[PDB]
Design a binder for this molecule. Sequence first.
Ligand SMILES: CO[C@@H]1O[C@H](CO)[C@H](O)[C@H](OCc2cn([C@@H]3O[C@H](CO)[C@H](O)[C@H](OCc4cn([C@@H]5O[C@H](CO)[C@H](O)[C@H](O)[C@H]5O)nn4)[C@H]3O)nn2)[C@H]1O
Ligand SMILES: [Cl-]
Length: 139
Amino acid sequence: GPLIVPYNLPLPGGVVPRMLITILGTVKPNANRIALDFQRGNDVAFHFNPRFNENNRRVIVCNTKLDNNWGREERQSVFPFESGKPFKIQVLVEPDHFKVAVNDAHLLQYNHRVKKLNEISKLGISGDIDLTSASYTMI
Ligand SMILES: CO[C@@H]1O[C@H](CO)[C@H](O)[C@H](OCc2cn([C@@H]3O[C@H](CO)[C@H](O)[C@H](OCc4cn([C@@H]5O[C@H](CO)[C@H](O)[C@H](O)[C@H]5O)nn4)[C@H]3O)nn2)[C@H]1O
Ligand SMILES: [Cl-]
C-alpha cells in the first residue's frame, strides 16, 4: 500500500536511455519538500527537489552532488505539485538528459553531468509524501 519514506529503489546496473522510472504518491497536507535522488554511490547524479515554501514561492531545484559538494542549481518555476493531491512523476532517461513529466505533462530536462549512467544504481525517494508505488520499465 503506502511505502516507507525515505524509500530506496535499486536500479540494477544503473540507468540507460529508454529506462522509464515511475513514482506514484500523494503530497501530504502543508507539505514542505519532495526529493528524488538518483545516486552513484555517495554522489547524487540527479537531485530533483520540489520546494513548497522557499521565501513564499514554490520552486523545483535540481542539482548534482560530487564528493559531497552540491553543484550549480537548475531551477524551474513551473510547479505542478499541490499539497493533498495525488501525483505521478515519470523520469525517462534519454541519451543527453533526464526528462521529467508530472501528471503526463512535460516538466523539465536535466543534462547528464555524471557520465557513468550504468553506475547510477539507486533512487532515493523522500519528503512530505505518501508513497504509493515506485518502479521502472524499459520502453
Ligand atoms: C532572482 O534572484 C534571486 O531572487 C531571490 C528572491 O528570494 C533570492 O534573493 C535569491 O538569492 C537568495 C536565495 C537563497 N536561496 C536558497 O534558499 C534556501 C532555503 O530555501 C537555502 O537558504 C539555500 O542555501 C542553503 C541550502 C543549501 N541547500 C541544499 O541545496 C541542495 C541542492 O542544491 C539540496 O537541495 C540540499 O538538500 C539542500 O540542503 N539547501 N539549503 C539558499 O541558497 N536561494 N536563493 C536570488 O538569487
Ligand atoms: Cl561520471
